[PDB]
Design a binder for this molecule. Structure first.
Ligand SMILES: CC[C@H](C)[C@@H]1NC(=O)[C@@]2(NC1=O)OC[C@](C)(O)[C@@H]2O
Ligand SMILES: O=C(O)CCC(=O)C(=O)O
Ligand SMILES: [Cl-]
Ligand SMILES: [Cl-]
Ligand SMILES: [Fe+2]
Length: 282
């Protein structure tokens, strides 16, 4: 693909998300993807280094050892190191383990991104016309700080003859993606387009839970279809993912908002992730 998407750029300011104007904000939310300026005080260098190292094993300091932590170590099949069928290999960790398992500076990064994402999500919920007292249940806790949050590190193995990462929608409400190299593509309006590279911005997009939640609103919001093209050289990235609380045995559920009525349950949060990962990776 040779077309490059023209995305709207936003900033977090005194009143929440600031786009250039109300029309720009509407286009961004209608597309389900936009750029978000990275706060100047926020240090991403340890996260960038973790994404470059996590897969390399205990010979490589300080982060290569996370290659050896599989899902078995967490009692949760979703977490730890995972080789995917595509070029991608990942390390995924939910917030309840960050303080104990991640390096301290990586847990700190995760916490910063959680509070940034929280602020982004609340701006979106307000634009959707959902009553504020329904936000906590509608977002499975992400309208406050009680959601499930995964800080997930990605490395694309260019020696594998696969697509980088198959076409998919994310599971949750908000993904804050840190990417510094080409490869991410988005499908708005049934044409694949490259996401412009800008290491001064995150890429923000909505997941399936945002789409389900707002599907009956006057302006439904989409979970952007996106992929990573086959990489001829290595690539890395990381993202902060916000989902309805999906702990084993403590699942907040996924809801659709019915204007003038309230929230109706659609499915489980973990169930949605499992069904989505099935539909993606085959
Ligand atoms: C347990 C997953 C968690 C809810 C979150 N959501 C996701 O969609 C993602 N990663 C995450 O960290 O999992 C699958 C994926 C397409 O590779 C993407 O990277
Ligand atoms: O690496 C990227 O740019 C995208 C990663 C992604 O889409 C995901 O982890 O769900
Ligand atoms: Cl601010
Ligand atoms: Cl590329
Ligand atoms: Fe994604």
């Amino acid at each position: 693909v040779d077309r490059t998407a023209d995305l709207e750029r936003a900033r977090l300011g005194d009143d929440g998300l600031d786009f250039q104007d109300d029309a720009a904000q509407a286009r961004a939310f209608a597309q389900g993807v936009f750029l978000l300026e990275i706060p100047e005080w926020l240090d991403l260098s340890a996260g960038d280094r973790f994404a470059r190292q996590f897969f390399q094993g205990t010979g490589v300091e300080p982060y290569g050892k996370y290659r050896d932590l599989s899902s078995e170590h967490f009692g949760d099949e979703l977490l730890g190191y995972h080789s995917r069928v595509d070029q991608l290999e990942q390390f995924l960790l939910e917030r309840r383990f960050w303080g104990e398992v991640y390096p301290s500076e990586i847990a700190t990064l995760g916490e910063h991104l959680t509070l940034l994402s929280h602020r982004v999500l609340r701006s979106v919920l307000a634009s959707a016309g959902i009553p504020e007292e329904d936000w906590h249940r509608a977002s499975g806790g992400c309208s406050e700080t009680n959601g499930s949050y995964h800080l997930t590190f990605n490395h694309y193995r260019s020696a594998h003859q696969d697509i980088g990462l198959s076409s998919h929608k994310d599971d949750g409400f908000i993904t804050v993606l840190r990417t510094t190299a080409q490869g991410l593509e988005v499908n708005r309006d049934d044409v694949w387009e490259k996401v412009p590279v800008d290491p001064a911005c995150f890429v923000v997009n909505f997941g399936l839970s945002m789409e389900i939640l707002t599907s009956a609103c006057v302006t439904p919001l989409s979970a952007i279809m996106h992929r990573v093209s086959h990489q001829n050289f290595d690539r890395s990235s990381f993202g902060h993912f916000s989902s309805s609380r999906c702990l084993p045995g403590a699942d907040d559920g996924i809801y659709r908002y019915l204007p003038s009525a309230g929230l109706e349950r659609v499915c489980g949060s973990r169930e949605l992730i499992e069904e989505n990962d099935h539909e993606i990776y085959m």
